[PDB]
Ligand binder design. Structure first.
Ligand code: BCL
Ligand code: BCL
Ligand code: BCL
Ligand code: BCL
Ligand SMILES: CC[C@H]1c2cc3[nH]c4c(c3C)C(=O)[C@H](C(=O)OC)c4c3nc(cc4[nH]c(cc(n2)[C@@H]1C)c(C(C)=O)c4C)[C@@H](C)[C@@H]3CCC(=O)OC/C=C(\C)CCC[C@@H](C)CCC[C@H](C)CCCC(C)C
Ligand SMILES: CC[C@H]1c2cc3[nH]c4c(c3C)C(=O)[C@H](C(=O)OC)c4c3nc(cc4[nH]c(cc(n2)[C@@H]1C)c(C(C)=O)c4C)[C@@H](C)[C@@H]3CCC(=O)OC/C=C(\C)CCC[C@@H](C)CCC[C@H](C)CCCC(C)C
Ligand SMILES: COC1=C(OC)C(=O)C(C/C=C(\C)CC/C=C(\C)CC/C=C(\C)CC/C=C(\C)CC/C=C(\C)CC/C=C(\C)CC/C=C(\C)CC/C=C(\C)CC/C=C(\C)CCC=C(C)C)=C(C)C1=O
Ligand SMILES: CCCCCCCCCCCC[N+](C)(C)[O-]
Ligand SMILES: [Cl-]
Ligand SMILES: [Fe+2]
Lengths: 235, 281, 300
């Protein structure tokens, strides 16, 4: 019967489609590893996908995935049990060391470029036209931590230019240097910006950027990872 | 076994209950107290479904059907074989679903991410609870809930829908459907857009997010943006399910008639109600 | 930290005019007004839009489809504005009766205007389809949006054109009315022996529900990792960051497996596309091949 043949065929295709979809989804992170970093005997029933390449714009090279993978950063944790399945505990200061929910990835130490090849994220001070067009403007407001003390004042917004969105508040500290604070980790209020993740004295340890007008993908991850990490490690 | 980048994330912490006592993984799966709770509830609910299937005398999953109590039982407990297995299974399902959500919360905490996911899953849990708990309670009987059977629950949808005429006329069902159709449209477009940029024409470098905005702007005159499309997908699918729950909560509780009658707040309005002509004149 | 569901502070700058690539800039409009209202949820910027030959054709036949339905509705209203608003949703432009078969010779008032309206709908959708394809091409992008659009088109084609032709009469097609197309849908299922038992209909539903599952999962996931720039998905694909890693581990630890930043978009396009793909097959088979889904289900 043709309806019968169609539903039976469709189920064969869907098995095919799922298997294809699972292998596509194994382009990062696989092969699986034991907790000592050696590959795992068991890798599941789906084969690793054959490599694919992306040509990056703006002379930035190419990425091939899957491919030999490496944290190229040291990881300050130690195993907690002889057998697998247990937590690995920070050996050091997990916020300075970038582990657990303070983790950052070794992304390229180059800023994300827009379609024209210009830095995608720039402080309002370096981006013509841009301005708070609605809601409470944070600039010059005091930045307050979960300890309820003041860490600094907002001296700028770092803006995703193409998207026209506020990505970071730049906050000036006692010693007159500054740090980026992700917008999604701040509650802009009437009288203050409140940062629940960090106490006022953990702002100075936010990783610093190499340039006063640009932020690299590597710095963004260090910064965002550090700030998210405070929710656990400053509690 | 671990993803190649995973180990730096497997730290102690984030638990809501139990401290470090359930703070461990089984294979890929995080456990936690709510992971053992899900296990206890899921295990017992499945055991009772198997018992119910022995009581029915079939092992074919196309045939197994666990029915709620007869309507005469109202809201009281029923004997196992006469609706009690349903009621205990419903309690196990609820605890498993809520426990799954609380475990997601622990996982969010250990990873340092927002709680959007368990919060989004609560809408699905609230819709299941609408059908199996809130609505039956408001109507005064557990027999109003749906049976736990592959095809029998579809007979329940049909029986319940037809009871109110064409359910299509329920206006909160109309809003829910529009959300569901709009959600799939937005999902198709979002996957397409990102993939059409990451995988551009042959002989081209990877497109940037500006190409995605340009493309949508060329097509339609507006681009919601990368952050907006994810807010939008969440809003559409959650609103679909909110309006689903709403369209059932009002059905047989504040609404008892054929749903097509509701529409008279318009047709029979006293001024134009009487004009000769059209479809109702 | 708030939930990142509405922005806290809107920021606005010069309008982005867009990537040029191979886009014929003759056909691009100017920028529209910014919208603070839309600005709280997404981008504020309105425009430019592109309007080429195919878009003008599309807009023109779509307006003609609209006005063919419109002129019919006023005629059903007896040209009376208050009967027009009263019965707006009860008006129906119905296909030719079964006795005209597949003929184009139905009188203007007994199906002919439905044929004309359909002609216009057909030209509007297929022009819009070439347009989704051409806008991608001009930008050097993949043709995924045009490809996904064809799955929606397939269902609409089955309902209005392919199934009625195979059945022998335009009378099988869906009428142009708000309430009347709801009635057609219910009648469809009733005459075909209950569409719940159409296995392609149950798959279409698994994929419709699964679309809401998946976009809730994914929408929530990206907002959960927006504190790490997770919505910048293309650069996370080119250069995996802690956003993509924490998102993947959330799911791996929750359900045992996970996606990648690119591959979640393959799950997504397929989940959605399958709704109308299986849907079109199930409608196409109804009455041409299976008269009674419930009966067919018990037997073959
Ligand atoms: C003949 C039937 C009537 C009719 C009668 C009804 C009735 C009656 C109902 C609907 C409901 C719905 N109908 Mg209707 N409906 C009709 C025609 C239609 C049409 C159409 C094209 O014609 C459409 C689009 C719809 C669409 C819809 C949806 C709006 C809604 C179902 C979604 C939902 O509630 O999600 C909510 C999601 C859930 C309930 C899922 C929750 C599950 C979670 C919490 C956990 C489960 C996990 C577990 C078991 C996992 C297993 C382990 C494995 C590892 C996976 N109907 C006709 C006219 N309709 C229902 C509704 O609104 O309910 C609220 C409803 O009750
Ligand atoms: C939402 C409104 C109605 C309703 C109306 C309909 C309609 C109409 C249809 C379905 C269909 C299905 N429904 Mg229902 N369904 C309801 C509530 C539920 C509940 C519940 C706990 O609330 C569950 C588990 C299901 C499950 C199912 C699947 C058997 C089937 C495909 C759904 C799907 O893929 O969704 C999206 C989710 C995914 C893609 C993720 C996968 C999850 C699925 C595979 C889990 C199945 C679990 C089941 C076997 C029980 C598990 C027991 C465990 C071993 C413990 N329904 C409510 C009452 N349902 C369709 C069907 O084909 O029936 C056979 C169909 O046409
Ligand atoms: C009493 C009613 C019957 C029934 C009869 C039918 C029939 C008949 C059909 C469905 C179909 C569907 N049903 Mg059903 N259905 C019932 C009960 C349900 C229930 C339930 C009870 O919970 C659910 C969840 C569903 C769910 C679904 C969907 C999975 C599916 C539609 C997919 C879609 O995206 O269409 C929406 C998308 C489209 C129609 C594509 C549109 C494409 C483009 C080209 C349109 C261009 C528009 C442009 C020109 C105009 C713009 C302006 C406008 C004014 C807006 N049904 C009951 C059993 N159902 C469809 C299907 O696929 O069946 C297998 C279908 O034909
Ligand atoms: C899928 C099976 C049925 C069907 C069943 C339903 C049901 C059931 C509902 C709709 C609803 C709607 N349908 Mg319909 N609809 C069908 C085919 C169509 C076609 C077509 C091109 O064939 C079009 C333009 C529409 C258009 C519309 C809109 C008026 C309205 C909301 C759609 C939406 O959310 O889109 C996104 C942009 N339908 C087929 C025939 N449609 C809903 C409504 O609000 O009706 C007044 C509603 O509840
Ligand atoms: C609210 C928006 C949509 C949505 C969202 C959503 N669903 C979600 C989530 C989110 C955000 C999750 O985080 C969570 C998840 O982990 O996904 C992989 C989940 C989930 N949604 C799931 C299913 C599901 N979601 C659905 C719907 C939706 N989910 C909505 C449309 C549907 C349907 C029918 O539309 C289904 C079937 C699971 C994959 C997962 C929940 C997993 C879970 O809770 O596991 C613990 C429980 C078990 C492993 C089994 C125990 C159950 C037993 C006690 C007995 C079973 C009884 C059951 C009532 C029988 C019914 C039989 C049927 C034939 C009727
Ligand atoms: C694959 C599954 C899902 C899907 C996917 C999908 N739909 C798609 C696409 C994709 C990938 C597109 O690329 C394409 C698009 O361009 O998206 C923005 C589209 C599209 N899907 C659309 C609608 C649509 N999709 C639907 C469904 C779905 N689409 C599925 C759920 C539905 C329903 C019923 O569920 C509808 C109604 C359009 C928004 C768009 C196709 C546009 C098109 O074909 O246009 C031709 C017609 C015109 C240009 C007419 C002009 C306007 C007329 C209404 C005249 C009115 C003028 C008057 C003076 C005032 C206007 C007011 C009136 C509206 C009252
Ligand atoms: C960008 O980011 C993102 C990712 O990553 C980068 C992701 O991966 C994902 C995740 C999405 C996918 C991987 C796509 C596939 C997912 C679906 C189509 C949704 C449907 C999912 C299922 C049907 C699987 C259901 C599996 C369950 C519920 C597991 C049940 C098995 C068990 C053994 C239970 C475990 C019990 C416990 C608690 C502990 C044991 C003691 C998303 C959304 C995402 O946006
Ligand atoms: C519906 C979803 C079905 C897909 C199941 C995929 C599970 C793959 C498991 C891979 N692994 C070994 C890493 O866990
Ligand atoms: Cl055009
Ligand atoms: Fe995405």
């Amino acid at each position: 019967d043709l309806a019968s043949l169609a539903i039976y065929s469709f189920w064969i295709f869907l098995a095919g489609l799922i298997y294809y979809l699972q292998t596509e989804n194994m382009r990062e992170g696989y092969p699986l590893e034991n907790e000592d970093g050696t590959p795992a005997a068991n890798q599941g029933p789906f084969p690793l996908p054959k490599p694919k390449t992306f040509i990056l714009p703006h002379g930035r090279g190419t990425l091939t995935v899957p491919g030999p993978e490496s944290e190229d950063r040291p990881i300050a944790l130690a195993r907690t049990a002889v057998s697998e399945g247990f937590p690995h505990a920070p050996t050091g200061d997990p916020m300075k060391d970038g582990v657990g929910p303070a983790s950052w990835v070794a992304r390229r130490d180059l800023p994300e470029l827009d379609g024209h090849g210009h830095n995608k994220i720039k402080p309002m001070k370096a981006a013509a036209g841009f301005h708070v067009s609605a809601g409470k403007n944070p600039i010059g407001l005091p930045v307050r931590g979960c300890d309820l003390e003041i860490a600094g004042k907002v001296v700028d917004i770092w803006v995703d230019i193409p998207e026209q969105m506020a990505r970071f508040l730049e906050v000036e500290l006692k010693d007159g240097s500054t740090r980026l604070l992700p917008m999604q980790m701040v509650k802009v209020q009437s009288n203050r910006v409140h940062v629940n993740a960090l106490s006022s004295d953990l702002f100075a340890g936010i990783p610093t950027i190499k340039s006063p007008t640009e932020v690299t993908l590597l710095e963004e991850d260090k910064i965002c990872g550090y700030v998210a990490g405070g929710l656990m490690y400053a509690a | 076994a671990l993803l190649s980048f995973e180990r730096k994330y497997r730290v102690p912490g984030g638990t809501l209950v139990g401290g470090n006592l359930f703070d461990f993984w089984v294979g890929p799966f995080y456990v936690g107290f709510f992971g053992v709770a899900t296990f206890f509830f899921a295990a017992l609910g499945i055991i009772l479904i198997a018992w119910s299937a022995v009581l029915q005398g079939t092992w074919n999953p196309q045939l197994i059907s666990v029915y709620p109590p007869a309507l005469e039982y109202g809201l009281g407990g029923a004997p196992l074989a006469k609706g009690g297995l349903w009621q205990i299974i419903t309690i196990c399902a609820t605890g498993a679903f809520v426990s799954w959500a609380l475990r997601e919360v622990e996982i969010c905490r250990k990873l340092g991410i927002g709680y959007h996911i368990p919060f989004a899953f609560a809408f699905a849990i609230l819709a299941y609870l609408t059908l199996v708990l809130f609505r039956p309670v408001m109507m005064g009987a557990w027999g109003y809930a749906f049976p736990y059977g592959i095809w029998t629950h579809l007979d329940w949808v049909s029986n319940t829908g037809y009871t109110y005429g064409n359910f299509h006329y329920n206006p909160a069902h109309m809003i829910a459907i529009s959300f569901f159709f709009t959600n799939a449209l937005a999902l198709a477009l979002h996957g397409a857009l990102v993939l059409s940029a990451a995988n551009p024409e042959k002989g081209k470098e990877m497109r940037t997010p500006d190409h995605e905005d340009t493309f949508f702007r060329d097509l339609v005159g507006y681009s919601i943006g990368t952050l907006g499309i994810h807010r939008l997908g969440l809003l559409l699918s959650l609103s679909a399910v909110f309006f689903s729950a709403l369209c059932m909560i009002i059905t047989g509780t504040i609404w008892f008639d054929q749903w097509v009658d509701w529409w008279q707040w318009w047709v029979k309005l006293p001024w134009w109600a009487n004009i000769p002509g059209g479809i109702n004149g | 930290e708030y939930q990142n569901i509405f922005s806290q502070v809107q920021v606005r700058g010069p309008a982005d005019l867009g990537m040029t690539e191979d886009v014929n800039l003759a056909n691009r409009s100017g920028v529209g007004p910014f919208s603070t209202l839309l600005g709280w949820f997404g981008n504020a910027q309105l425009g430019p839009i592109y309007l080429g030959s195919l878009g003008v054709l599309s807009l023109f036949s779509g307006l003609m489809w609209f006005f063919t339905i419109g002129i019919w509705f006023w005629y059903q209203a007896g040209w009376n504005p208050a009967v027009f608003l009263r019965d707006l949703f009860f008006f129906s432009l119905e296909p030719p009766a079964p006795e005209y078969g597949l003929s184009f010779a139905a009188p203007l008032k007994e199906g002919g205007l439905w044929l004309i309206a359909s002609f216009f709908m057909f030209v509007a959708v297929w022009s819009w389809w070439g347009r989704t394809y051409l806008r991608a091409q001009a930008l050097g992008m993949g043709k995924h949006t045009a490809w996904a659009f064809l799955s929606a088109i397939w269902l609409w084609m089955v309902l209005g054109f392919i199934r009625p032709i195979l059945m022998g009469s335009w009378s099988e097609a869906v009428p142009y009315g708000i309430f009347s197309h709801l009635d057609w849908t219910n009648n469809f299922s009733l005459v075909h022996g209950n569409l719940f038992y159409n296995p392609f209909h149950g798959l279409s539903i698994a994929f419709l529900y699964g679309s809401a599952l998946l976009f809730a999962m994914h929408g929530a996931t990206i907002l959960a990792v927006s504190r790490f720039g997770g919505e910048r998905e293309l650069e996370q694909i080119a250069d995996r960051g802690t956003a993509a890693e924490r998102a993947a581990l959330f799911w791996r630890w929750t359900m045992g497996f996970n996606a990648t930043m690119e591959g979640i978009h393959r799950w997504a396009i397929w989940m959605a596309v399958l709704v109308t793909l299986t849907g079109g097959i199930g409608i196409l088979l109804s009455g041409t091949v299976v008269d009674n889904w419930y009966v067919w289900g018990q037997n073959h």
